Structure formats: structure tokens, C-alpha cells
Amino acid sequence: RPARCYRYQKNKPYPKSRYNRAVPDSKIRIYDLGKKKATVDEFPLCVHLVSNELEQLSSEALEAARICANKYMTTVSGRDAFHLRVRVHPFHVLRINKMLSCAGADRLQQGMRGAWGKPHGLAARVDIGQIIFSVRTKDSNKDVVVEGLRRARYKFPGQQKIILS
RNA sequence: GCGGAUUUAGCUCAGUUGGGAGAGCGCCAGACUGAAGAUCUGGAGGUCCUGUGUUCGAUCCACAGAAUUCGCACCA
RNA sequence: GGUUGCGGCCAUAUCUACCAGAAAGCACCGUUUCCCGUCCGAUCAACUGUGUUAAGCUGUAGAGCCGACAGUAGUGUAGGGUGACCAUACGCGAAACUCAGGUGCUGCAAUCU
RNA sequence: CCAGCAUCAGUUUUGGUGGCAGGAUAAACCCAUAGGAAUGUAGCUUGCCUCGGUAAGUAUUAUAGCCUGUGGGAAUACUGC
RNA sequence: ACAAUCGACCGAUCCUGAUGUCUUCGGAUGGAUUUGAGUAAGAGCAUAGCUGUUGGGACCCGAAAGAUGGUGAACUAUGCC
RNA sequence: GGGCGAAAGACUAAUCGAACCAUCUAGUAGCUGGUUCCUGCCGAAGUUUCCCUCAGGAUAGCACGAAGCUCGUUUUAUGAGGUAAGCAAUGAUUAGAGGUCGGGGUCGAAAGACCUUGACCUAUUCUCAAACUUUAAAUAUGUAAGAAGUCCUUGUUACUUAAUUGAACGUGGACAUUUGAAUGAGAGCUUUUAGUGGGCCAUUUUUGGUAAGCAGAACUGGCGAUGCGGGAUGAACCGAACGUAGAGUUAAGGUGCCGGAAUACACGCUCAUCAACAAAAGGUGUUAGUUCAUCUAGACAGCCGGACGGUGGCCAUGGAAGUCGGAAUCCGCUAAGGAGUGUGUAACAACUCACCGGCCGAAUGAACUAGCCCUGAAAAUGGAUGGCGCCAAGCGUGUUACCUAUACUCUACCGUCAGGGUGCCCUGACGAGUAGGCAGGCGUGGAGGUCGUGACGAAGCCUGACCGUAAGGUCGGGUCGAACGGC
RNA sequence: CAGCAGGUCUCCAAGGUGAACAGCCUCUAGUUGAUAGAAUAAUGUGAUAAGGGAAGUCGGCAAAAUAGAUCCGUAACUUCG
RNA sequence: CAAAAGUGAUGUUGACGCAAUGUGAUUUCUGCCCAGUGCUCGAAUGUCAAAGUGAAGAAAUUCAACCAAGCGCGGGUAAACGGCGGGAGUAACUAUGACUCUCUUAAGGUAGCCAAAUGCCUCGUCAUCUAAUUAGUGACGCGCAUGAAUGGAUUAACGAGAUUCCCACUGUCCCUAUCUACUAUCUAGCGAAACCACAGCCAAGGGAACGGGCUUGGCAGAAUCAGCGGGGAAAGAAGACCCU
RNA sequence: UAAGGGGGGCUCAUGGAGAACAGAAAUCUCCAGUAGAACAAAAGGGUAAAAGCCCCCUUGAUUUUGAUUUUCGUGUGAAUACAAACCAUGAAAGUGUGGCCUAUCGAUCCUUUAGCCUCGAAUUUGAGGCUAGAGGUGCCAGAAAAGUUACCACAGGGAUAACUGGCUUGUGGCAGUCAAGCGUUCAUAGCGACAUUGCUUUUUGAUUCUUCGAUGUCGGCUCUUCCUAUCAUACCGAAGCAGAAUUCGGUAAGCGUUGGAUUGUUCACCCACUAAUAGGGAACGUGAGCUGGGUUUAGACCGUCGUGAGACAGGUUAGUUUUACCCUACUGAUGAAUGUUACCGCAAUAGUAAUUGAACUUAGUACGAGAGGAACAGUUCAUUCGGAUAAUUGGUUUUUGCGGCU
């Protein structure tokens, strides 16, 4: 499984706190970054990395894009004039099959029967309209996140359409 | 389908159809010895399986239950 | 002209600020041997005192609540295209957003005018 | 005896060519006249620089857009012959 | 047991529109009520014959296997001298 | 099941873990295989309640066979999503700030006092959920009712009922008529003698691995039991229905050529043989539209200069020098040089210039949007991304001509049955086909019958003619030396 | 089963060479089978040889050293055979 | 131990023996256990098979239902089968646990030996050998899980049985050649064998799924004999895996 | 057995506000709020008119029934008016066959008992058919009670598997590359946080799609192909490289690509050289050419597990390679077609051959601190292959001659 094979979803929803026999740990370090304070305060300009598609942005790549852009935005300042968000969470626990095997095995591990994707990963859904990487950035001079949206969509499956918001 | 043994102080058990119970090992504290052992003293530790009766009086006798243990018969 | 009851009936029938009326009719004021009840006067009781009370109404817009014109997504029966989607036959077409609006409806019973 | 297929003479059904017309309509292959708005080409004159051209006047050489008024043209979707 | 009384149902009765025939009888259909009555309402038995099947030479074919009675120590395991 | 063992069930007529021969015996096989005329009428199903039940079968779903009869198109409503859309409620987290108490710091013997980073609330700012839903379609569907004729008054009797409700009869009114002839089904119910009881694929959505054909639930078409055309090869798709034939007209789709039909017409980017997969990420091929900086107020390029005085401006620092970091932000000479575009030495030492100067004299350049191109792209038998090969014989947009399904379509003919009236004729609707049933037709051995034919030549052998519904039988020739059919 | 490369009790004992009954070789004494000729590939069936001395192959498998008579000379340790 | 029973083997053997089982000559020796189970032995003491209530007169007859053993309980015995511990603390100094405490059970092992026909961990750890050498041979301790009678241990002779070093050496190979016997080639005679798919190119393409056989394209003539092991998959039996 | 019926009375959990007390509070209270508390046991669900709180007395855990309907094919089950039976409660109205909606068990066979309708001259009685109850048949719709199974026989089965081919690339490899970091300054001499997109089919497997009248294994010998994801040979360019040592990239598949030791063995792991010792697929040519060490049964033993016969995802000892290629691939040799034809040359075409090092010698020159020692010539030969190969080599030569023993 590369993130080529963490693209779409015939994995249907499954995400509540009541009905769950415990989720694994995530990678996710921080949501809002640069400014914590200013959402639309200092920043009347935004770029949204709006999805064309209805994909699962897996928690693997979710931290990846965000941490590349974290390390990058220290040169300009470690709290420069941007506001890189994480939005929609891994609420849904990503079900992934295997260890599997029909005959000739330890106990037999099935696949077909034993259809339950035995909980391995975590993934967020980033459907149409939705974004994770909302970048509220400054009006004049230092806009830095247009560049840092190549670095956002790279660590993301799919072909996201860049919309000025 | 029908009968026998056992239940007592923590643990090991002594011992009993009416005047109402007994010692070791252990536990503690003080003597004692050059010290540990040994042993006395003092502290104690149970209403003798349990519910309810009989009697002047009950561990003890009665009706009935809990529970460990043991045997024959079953239909063939 | 009014007062009281029975409602049917639930969120356009909901709440606050604040005013105002008294014996046709209503409600507070105040207290108890003995029945009757207890923790306690919650059964029962004169002339009078009085709007405290509660049902009700006026004054009132602060809020529940509410609305054109207009703008618009999906889509059966089908019919045209695309990798992670987009666009059409043909029949209908919202919230969001707004000119603006707003103090119920209806039937029945008793009594005075 | 059905199908293919049959002398010789006359006729139907269905569609088109070509010639012509009605419903109903007037643009045209291309159609008059008067007044006002416009502005293209040829020829002449004048001015200025330069050897190659350009600007202004030219209704007084010749001709037009678009509108208004008056007057006159006008064969065809459909449908039939 | 009589019978009273209810039921599948037969037969009667009543009504709608068309309706032969008339202000009088007669024919048929659909639905419903009322009312009278009978049969285990199955209202004959026998027979040539047919059907699918239980059974019957049992559609044709492919096995491992039991009980009973014979014959083999001619070869061969063992015995003895 | 005994004989026998130092063991290996070695051994016993090639058979020994129970000798061999014969009989009962054709033991039996819940499993598998094989299995004999034709046409016509006509023809499904792979689904289920349920089982010590599973390659089966009682029952049910669906059409067998036979007799007697059986729609809807759509109008009025009534019941049910929460798709839609959302964060009220509940669920999971991102933001500003406000601020009790708590926590930290400091002065204090513990005790006491002074400050301050984190709270609900709440205002402002912003994320968001299969067991989370305030509001709540078109469109399909149920259930009831209607388009296709029933409503209402008065009086009496019996039940219910001691009131009253509900119904039928008596009785009045509302509610259509002339003329001629006569009754339609595309759906219900009953019942004898079979079959299925194991299927495939395409479209679409769900739970679910969108890594995979993992695996399950809903809904729909064709095949199963279907002609023919299209597609190089391929049941499902497209067009679509078939008994039997030639015409009349055209679908789905084709016309440079193998192989029939334009080397056509008009306009156009592009000519790479594009046509023939592919993202991040990127480009002076090449064209168009829109907006704007910019322009005789001298756009822009090349070539050519002034590289100035204050001055090493100031300050990071060991040193900082325009040339480290950071701020002031000028004066100068007021037709230009900023307190600076790029290079260079630790650095000076050295060098170049946007800013800007001087020649020249017209449309140039940034964005923004669209199209053709173009870069990213590796594997083993002989073209291998077409055979010949095509630069238009590619492709878009607009047009025209030619070709095109047993369907479409003309008319006749073949199959059973109905009605009118026998003898049967008119004539409706349909006719691809496997199980299966019924009907009809051809069939052997044999026979009650048996006459007829025969030795002047019977069956047979062999060979020819040889009707037409698929089934197989009459006549005729060469020849036989006794058998066999009218009815 | 066989006109089959077979099973099959069991008798007799010369010369010289080598213990005997190995081998060697003649007697008394016997005999070459129910098809044949000529050449004599590839390939399967026999021996020889330079140089090397284990280097090769599952594989000292295969193949090599040596050998008699008579005399000399010779190892641990014993259940002391 | 055979046989239905008669009748015998065992056996005219007899404990100096007969037989089932365990076993193996030689030579030095043999520590310890009664929970669980069998065999054998023993008597203090507990249980299991032979009643009698009811019908003759308007309500007043008759006969069918407890006692013994093994067992319970107690005693003998392991050449019949079986059994032989955990947690915690502790010595100069890296480093270790003599000894001690505590829990648990019926109660916790000697003489002698070790990395196995048995070792997860392990190219463990060390010496010597080898062009590399883990074998040869030298030990290490880090025993997943050694231990005295269906026996440890002393210890000579013998083998178509099992490894290595060492000496001479070897067609096995390097390295193949040459010559020879017999046949193949070729011929005569008589005369087999199980044995009967229309058919017999390759590259690309579709596909009952790896085609000479089907779609296109390239290629493909016949009379005849000797050769050689690649496919089709020969000669054949209803597969060896695998499930009913 | 009240943890039921009926009457009568009441509205919370909880918070704020403190009160001597207080420990949150105990008890209480003013003030505010109202189905969020309470629910056998789970989840949903009902509910203030109370299904919650509070107090007393009652015994319906009820007889005899059922119109009209639920409704499964069935077995089997529910709603169920209404009337009588009929006791104690209430002023009466009043509503229920014990229950807030909301899982909670056993037949035929049987067993034994109570209630009491049908019988052999015939007075009794034997024998036999409603109903209700005993009894962990949990699969809730139910036969005392345990099995290895390999000497081996027979009939069937991808109804079912080892495993093959297909598919994806799961598990993952490679590259582009987002490029912040860090290497002396310094995103890319080099090193690369964090990882992803396309390709791909190698680590390593997901899947019963396609297969039981055969789908026989591994390392090597031998001989029959094609490609380059490139070790070496031809040709080129660049560096943070002084010549030269060192470091990196492009054009391009004709040819060359070792010898031994550890280990079954490529892997694992070491050595001696040599100019030096590559990558990938192809039924890895590959058991009717070949070995049968690696690799599907059968003597016997140990460890480990089970009452045991015996077993094991653990090891050890012996234990079947038969035969003549039908058709084709295919390598040699002959026979016949535009008169004929002994004899041989065009090249429209088919098959083929292949490599490297050292030495003489270039040169002691280029260039350098020092070790060192480049461009480029002419000349010769040694490993190795094929064809040619018969003399100076090495050997064989049964043909024809020579030595010894019975």
C-alpha cells in the first residue's frame, strides 16, 4: 500500500466513540501552524486546495504535507505570516485486511469470510468542497503558501484544484 | 429404590446420651542463657456446622437444613 | 356592555419589561374546642377589611416566531461523455438570502347589563 | 402446382424529374422617387520638407452608406397538379 | 330418538337494463333476499382398455461382501524319526 | 480366526491380512455412465417455508395437459424516507479572548500577604459525526377510492337494545332516451397423468478489500429456449424478432485499398505519420480572444556611458569594509546616480550597472483565457501501436452524394382452432425452441379372416424407374421353382 | 500349456604337467542346433599410448601399487585363548 | 492349554525342573522415595434378595411384602505400573552465592558424565590444522530438557557395517587419438507385437483460458532412403498429491 | 406471596444560596429548574395525565368462555369484544383473567398421581382412550455411550485440496521528485528530514478464477535462443581532479565475461590471482540426452504430546529412473519437369568469421612538494576458437617381422 492505494473509498464510514473496540495511534502532531491567532484577522487572502475528488487522505500523508511545510516555514520565520491548518480528522478508523490466507496456514486466516478489515490504519476523508490544507496568508508582499501548495498536493493523492478564497 | 462415617481454638486434633470443653504447633509480650535452643509466666485465640425447639439446666436430647466423605440397589 | 365555566386544540396558541380595574362575579386577609388528618388547621367557619393573589384586559415590540420577489443543488423514465469525475434529454425545482409581516381560531353553558 | 418466369394490349398504386398553380407570405437571383444624414475614388489647385512624398481646400469633376416620407415590386416552407 | 334448528347445496322466489308479447304472459342473464325440500347429494354395478406408480424377468451396465457344502500340505511354513 | 514363528502377518499351487472350487446369486450400488420414429399444437425453471437435513425430497413459487369463466388507462387522495441540507440536540477538535478557583513565583516560623499563567459561563472567531438529525422534493411504490350512476324522505316490524346504534321492508322524491341490432377479455378460479428443485452475462446502487475477480443485500435487461445485420476473431451491448420466396424502403454502422461504394465539396489550427495509454512537474514549437502596465508626452532591444561630492554615512563584530545585522531615509549638483542591479577578494585590493545616460524611431511587453503542439514513458519468437502505407487518404465544424437487418414493408402461400352455413369455406391473432403432455400419421413379428395371386413362373437375390410433408414404398427389368396380400 | 536360452533324483573315475577333484591336455570315446553372402558407417559392444598425478564425477564406484619359495628383521596393550 | 462331552498334551519332566515374561558371556559395583495405580494379604467392622391394609349388606370377604460375599475398611509390597519443587535475600572489588529465610506439596536426588539417534539459543567460545578448513582435534560452560536393575560402570578378542590424516599411485578427468572383434549399410527366405480421430507451418490476434487446425499476414510441391532425441507429450494404468 | 388488585396523597434526580454544626452534604431551608432521574439484565423504548416518590388495608398468580380478526404451507401462535361464574376492597365513576413498552426453554416416547365419562353369563374387577404435574433431551423443532486408522480392497469427487496458468502489486523493489536541511561558505561535489506520483512485477504472496482416465523434485555436466534494467572492449563530455591516481554522466548489443575452499548448495562466507570476473526473461535446452547427492509411502530409535492402539508445523537409520519416437522440428545421400548437354565463371541473394595480455620499444620526454612518470609510433608474440593439419615433433599400427614359458 503506497498512497496510490490509499486513494478512493469502498471503505464506508465507521467512526464513533461509543461503538469501537479501540483505535490505534495517529501521526498527527499539530493542526494550526504559523499563526495560531490569526484566521481571517491578519489574512484576508487564502488559497484552498479544493478536492476534485472524493478521496481518503490517509493519516500517513496528512502528517507528511504538514511537516514538510512546517520545516520549510522556519526560514522566513517559525511563526511567519501564514496559517496552515488541518481540518477534517481521521474520525473514521481505516480498516485494512491481512494477515489473510485461505488453506495451508497457521489456523487458517480466511479473507472472504472474515470480511472484517481488522483495524490497522487511520484515514481522514477529504471529499468534494472539503480541504485539510487551508492556508490563510497575507495580503501584500509575503505570500508564501502558493509555493507551499505544490508541497501540499504532492503529499496528498489526487488532482486538487487550487481556488483563491 | 436405600443406608453408613465426618464437621471441636488459625492449623494439627484429644474427648463426651444433661451440672454446660481439653492440649500441642503457631501468634504475641516478660522473664531466662555469654547467645540461639529449651521452658515457665502473663496476654490470649471456641457459645463443639447451621435455623428453630425440649429442660430446672444443653456441646450433649429433638425436628429440619448446609457440606466434605463412603457403600449397595437401579435395568438387565 | 361585563364576569365565570366547559372546552376542542398546540409551539405563529410563547415569555419579559410595564400599566390598570373590584363586589353582578372572583381572589387574597385571619384563626380554631371537637369530628377528621398530620410534621403542620389541607374538613369548616360573622359584620368587614382589601388587590397581596390568580384568572383577565389595556398599553406595548424587546425577543420567540415569521416572509415574497428572486436565486438555485441533486434526479427516476432515459440519454450524452470522463482515470481519480462532469454534463444532458424531459417533468418539478429549497434552506442559505430578502422586500417585509405579526398579539390565535372556533363551538358551547350559567348569570347580570 | 406454389415461388423465379412468360406472348401481346390496356390500366392502377407509390415516388421523382420537368412544366405549372393554390393555401399563405415577401424577402429577393434583386425592384422607384423626394428630402436630410454620410464619406470613397479620380482629377485639379495651393502650402511645406525631401527626392521621395504628405497636409489642406476640392458641396464648384464624379459617386455612396443610414433614417424618414411617398410610391412601386414580390414563386411559394406547406399542399396540390 | 323423535323433532326443533343451523350449514355446503338443489330448486323456487325477487329485482335491475336490453327483452319476444301485452299493460298480459313468456324467455334468458347477473346479483341479492326470502322460502320449500332431499341425498353420507360419492345418487349404479360389471367390462374391453389406457395412465403414472408401489409390485412384477423390472431400463441396460459397473463393485469391495455374508451363510452353506466340497476339494487342496501334488507346491509350501512346522513337526517327528 | 485354525495350522505356525529366533518376528517378517514370511508361509500354504504364483491368489495367503484368513487358501481354492462350487452353489444360494442375475447379492447389492442412496453414486456415476449408456439407452432406438416424425411433424404439429405448444413449452417453463435454477425460487421457497422447512429437515440428524445437504449431488435428495414433503410444500410453496412459476409455466405443462383438459373443461368452465376471468384486463386497464389513470383520477381523487392517504401512508412511509430524511436522499436533500445541517452542527439545534448529541459526537469529535481546531481560534480569539474573558476569568472564579487552582497552580507558579516572591516576601513570611507552620500560620499570613502580594502578584500572575491556565475555567465553566459568555462574546467573538472557526472546524466538524453510520448507531448524530430541528427543517424535509421531483420520481418510483403501497393502501384506499374514482374516472365506468346512486343519493334522500316518511312509516312499520324483529333482533341488538331496556336509551340508542345498525340493517331490511312499506312509501314519497331526486336521478336520461330514440331507434336498430345485440355482447367484446390483453385477467380469475378449479383440477388430472409430467418438469424445475444445480445456471451464465451486462446495467445500477448498497454493506465491503475501491490494492485485487476479497464476500454479502437490492433492482433491471438479454441469454437459458431466438432469427438476421454490425464487430478482422468474442452468447451479454447496439438495431431488433424469428414459419416460406422475390421485389418496396431503410437502422445500427461503412466508401484510400486487401474487399463493394467520394482519391468528393466548403472552411480552419496543425503536417508530427499526429492518428496509438499514463501523473507529479515543466517548455523561446505555433495560433486566437480579453484585460492591463507601456507609447511621438519618444515604447523596447543592441551598441555606447556618468561610474560623482559628503565618505570608509551609521551600526552587528575578533574584523564588517555599499558589500554582516538593522534602521534612519537624505543632502549633494536641484535637465541623472540610489545611501545600490550584479560580480569580486577572509576583507581591503578590485569591477559592473537596473536606477540611469546617449544613438535610433514603432508598436512592443506583462498578465489572463482558450486551442493545436510538446516534455515526463524500460523487457526478451519475424512487421509488432495496421498489410500496402497515407503529410491528408489525419482531426474539428458545416454540407452533400453513394451503400445499409427474413425486421421495416408489399402481396400471396404452409400449421392446428373459432364464429356464419354444410360438404367446409370465409378468416382473426400468433407461430425461435430444449423438458413435458395431448392429438395425428408412417412401422415389424402374429392373427380371428381368406378369398385373391402362382410354377404358362411366388417369396427372395440384384438392378433401374422412383410420387414428394419428415417418416421409407408402388411400379418395372434381368432372374427364381414355392410361397404369400383384396376384404 | 509350447519342437521355449528351463525345472530334473543320480551311478561309474587313465597318462604327464600343477597339493587334491583348481588349472594344464590327450585317451577309451562323442559331437557345432529348423535360413545365408558381401562390404564391414554413424552409433552400442575390446585393447594400446605422450605428458600430468587426483586436479574429475552423487560416487577411489572404476583403475593403479604388490605377489611365490627361503633367510633376516619387526609395534601399543590384554578377559594370558 | 485343546475338546460341546468322553479323552489327552503339559508328562513315563518335577523345582538339581516345567513354563510364561524380563534378559544376555565378561568384569568392578549399585544411592533413594508409599502420593497415584495393579498384584498380594488381612479382620477390627459398614451395606445388599423371604410385610399386611382394603370390598358379602337397604353401609357387616381373602391372600402374594429384607438378608450373604467382593466392596467400605484395614494390612503387606515397588525386577507390576509409577515418583525425585517455586519465590526472595545475601560474601572487600569487577563479579559471584556460599548459606539463610519464606511459600507450596505426599516428600524433593547419590556415585559418575554432557551441548547428544535429544539443544529453541549458536558461524556459541577457544586452541591447532588448511592457498580458505567449522571435520581432523582442542576444549568452553551460556545443560530449551543428564542421572544407577526392561541399569550406571570395568573392558580383551572378532566383521560384504561408519569419518579423517598419511605414503606410493591411479582413463575418473585433463585430452583425445588410434587399431580390433560383432552388427548397422545391404540381401534371401519364412514371418511378430499391443496397435483403427478428418488433419499435420510460423509470427501476431481473438478465444473452452498455452491453435499446424479459428482471423489477417508471411510461408509451405511430389517420387525415395540413411539418421536423431526438442515439441505434439509416445509405449499405458480410470493419478502418487488430494477429498468423499 | 408480594417485588399483584383497589382507595388516598405527592412531583424529581440536581444546582445555587449557608447553617453553630461539616466530614460535599448528613438533617433542613430559601431560591431556581422540571418527563435528561428512576428502570431485575442488555440494547432500544415509554413516561409527569405518570411507568417515579409516599402511606395503609386487601389476595383476581381467578373460574367458564369467545364474537370478530392476526396469521405461517405447516407444526405452532396472538389480538379477543362480551356475558355469566364470583370474594375481599371503593363515595361512585371505574379498569385488569398478576405485571412499564421491553429475550428468559422441551414432544411423541414416557413416568407416576389426582380429578372420574365409555366394561367378556355377570355382582365386583383385570386390561384400555380426556386434563394437570414430576424429569438441564441448550441443536432450544428431543435416539444408553469412546477411537488412531498406512498391510490393504472397491465405487465416486476441484461438490475439495497440494499445485499450475489468469488477475492485482497486497507485502514491496526501482526511478522521477516535492527539498527543507548539513557538508568548510553552500537545496542537490556529497549527504537527503519527510515521503509521494507515475511506472513495474524482483522482495514477498492476497485469490479456489482455471485444473484429478497424471500437474515427476533440486544443484551440476552436456548441447539447441533473444533482449539489454551495461561488468569489459569502440566514440564523446563535465567536477569542489595537479599529470596520474580519484569521482560522475551521454551515444551504443558485434565480441569477451577465471581458478579454488568453507557450506547439500547459488544464498551464507573467505582466499590466491588475472586485463578483469555483468543484469533480465525465455516450460531456468533440461529425467523416451544425464547424475539421482538435493527430492511425496513401507525395517528400527530418541525428544515431545495423549487413558491408549499411537501421534507430532521436531531430529535420526535402510528403503524401484521401464521401452523400439506414430506425426512434426531435423542432419546427411540419391531419383524427375520448355530440345539436349560432360565442364565453370556473375553476385538480383542465402549461410559466415569475431576477443584480450605481455615484450621489444616509445621516454625518461610532459608535469610535480614527494612517490611517480601521460600523449603517440614502429615491431613481435603467448593464452584461447574454428577451418586447414600428415615433414623437423609425441604415440598408436591384431596387417608384417623380431624375444620367453607349459
Do A88 and A126 form a contact (C-beta atoms < 8 A)?
Answer: yes
Experimental approach? cryo-EM
A164: β partners: A47
Rounded to whole angstroms, the Cα distance separating A94 from A6 reads 10
∠ Cα A48 A127 A47 (to 5°)? 0
CA of A137 to C1' of G6 (A): 112
Bridge pairing between strands A161-164 and A83-84? unpaired
Near-strand C residues (CB closer than 7 A): A 7-8, 52-55, 128, 157-159
Positions of chain F reached by protein Cβ under 7 A: 91-97, 125-132, 206-212, 214-215, 279-282
Residue A21 C-beta-side C-alpha neighbours within 13 Å: 4
Structure resolution, Å:
8.9
Q: What letter would DSSP give residue A153?
A: H
Rounded to whole angstroms, the Cα distance separating A59 from A120 reads 12
Rounded to whole angstroms, the Cα distance separating A45 from A138 reads 6
CA-based max dimension of chain A = 67
